[PDB]
């Protein structure tokens, strides 16, 4: 996701922390964050080149199909197993279990927070052949955009402006209300993990969404506008809510 998606996920998550996780997060964040996890939930994107080994950790490349399997797909372009967003979530969650080494656990917190978000963006678990939709060039209303960017940013930005009247917290607040009043039974399933982290579950949902919602109906050169926007917005909402709920549930397990 772009900035807005990560902020939403991290705002939802931080308000769902239990006392032990809330305490650990306050302790691990730098002073400059002013206690707010969401102020640093794009940090991982800002070290893609300084930590160039981290760049493949934001996504999963799959074959042209609707399936994900860790052993088949969780690898970087050189074939190194584990080097994908699912593998990164396992790595950094494991590191945080040691909290109160060799590792910087502030970085581990910021990585797991960002990557729990990215594994929920459908086009972060999608086809190698189109670079997760980056090579699918369309228009978003009147402007050129690639499909990946539409999912990272344009849908959310257009909703924030047109539907939420530029209210920086309107979408968050509406998602939180629905977590309580519309989605309670589902939320319980979203939180449950028979392990500490369950990223493969989330990735498998994501490639299915990439097939059925993101790529579906889209051809190079199309104009995506209201029909696509209104029909895909509920799945964006779902994935943001899932990401926030699962980030909190995972941190609660780690720090508990
Ligand atoms: C899980 O989370 C962890 C933590 O975030 C991730 O760890 C990171 O993993 C990446 C690789 O995936 C590492 O980067 C690579 O590091 C090696 C060198 O590794 C040694 O040096 C590291 C840096 O040390 C200096 O800096 C520190 C900090 O300032 C100082 O303290 C030191 O004194 C040094 O000055 C050091 O971090 C490494 O230690 C880690 O590993 C050891 C085990 O060996 C542990 O004991 C430690 O506790 C610690 O965990 C280690 O000592 C580089 O060689 C890599 O770069 C080369 O290769 C790249 C291609 O693969 C290429 O792009 C680069 O240009 C570079 O290429 C050059 O060198 C090659 C080899 O010689 C040549 O072939 C090539 O031609 C060219 O010349 C790369 O930088 C991170 O260091 C590591 N970070 C940490 C903190 O551990 C992990 O990836 C995560 N995994 C998943 C799945 O999420
Ligand atoms: C665990 O990991 C985090 C994230 O990587 C580290 O936090 C980062 O620390 C660095 C400093 O090491 C901060 O950058 C500095 O920010 C200040 C203020 O903007 C700059 O003045 C400073 O610039 C100087 O140093 C650079 C060194 O390369 C030079 O390029 C410049 O020219 C200039 O001389 C530098 O940019 C990051 O902002 C900060 N990131 C975050 C997200 O907080 C942890 O480092 C610790 O915490 C820091 C706040 C600071 O107190 C460090 O001294 C601490 O080590 C790191 N924890 C570790 C290693 O224990
Ligand atoms: C929070 O949950 C509420 C309730 O589900 C969401 O509002 C509902 O949004 C749906 C669209 O996802 C609306 O349904 C649509 O209505 C039109 C017109 O009838 C129809 O063409 C579509 O086929 C679809 O049925 C629904 O009217 C609306 N409900 C209410 C009471 O306003 C809301 O969007 C959710 N917000 C977030 C952030 O999740
Ligand atoms: Zn992202
Ligand atoms: Zn992206
Ligand atoms: Zn990212």
Numbering used by the authors: 1 to 100, 107 to 201, 203 to 263
Paper excerpt:
AtBFN2 (also called ENDO2) is a 34.5 kDa glycoprotein (the predicted mass for protein component alone is 30.5 kDa), encoded by the Arabidopsis thaliana At1g68290 gene. AtBFN2 follows the standard glycosylation pattern of plant S1/P1 endonucleases, with three glycosylation sites (Asn91, Asn110, and Asn184). While the P1 nuclease has a higher specificity for RNA over ssDNA, in a previous study we showed that the opposite is true for AtBFN2. Structurally, Zn2+-dependent endonucleases present a unique fold, and are classified into the P1/S1 nuclease family (pfam ID PF02265), itself part of the Phospholipase C (PLC)/P1 nuclease superfamily (pfam ID CL0368).
We improved the resolution of our earlier sulfate co-crystal from 1.76 Å to 1.22 Å, thus yielding more insight into the glycan structure. The glycan bound to Asn91 is especially well defined and we can discern both N-acetylglucosamines (GlcNAc), and a further six mannose moieties (Man). Further, the methyl group of GlcNAc1 is located within a small aliphatic pocket formed by Leu57, and Ala88. GlcNAc2, on the other hand, interacts via π-ring stacking with Trp53. While we were able to refine only one additional mannose moiety on the glycan bound to Asn184, we obtained a much more detailed structure for the one attached to Asn110. Interestingly, GlcNAc1 at Asn110 interacts specifically with a single sulfate molecule, which itself interacts with Arg46 and Arg50, and with the aromatic nitrogen of Trp43. The sulfate binding pocket seems well prepared to bind ligands which are both negatively charged and contain de-localized π-orbitals. Pocket two is occupied in the sulfate co-crystal structure by sulfate, suggesting that it should be possible for the ssDNA backbone to be bound in a similar fashion. In the SO4 co-crystal structure, however, only Wat3 remains.
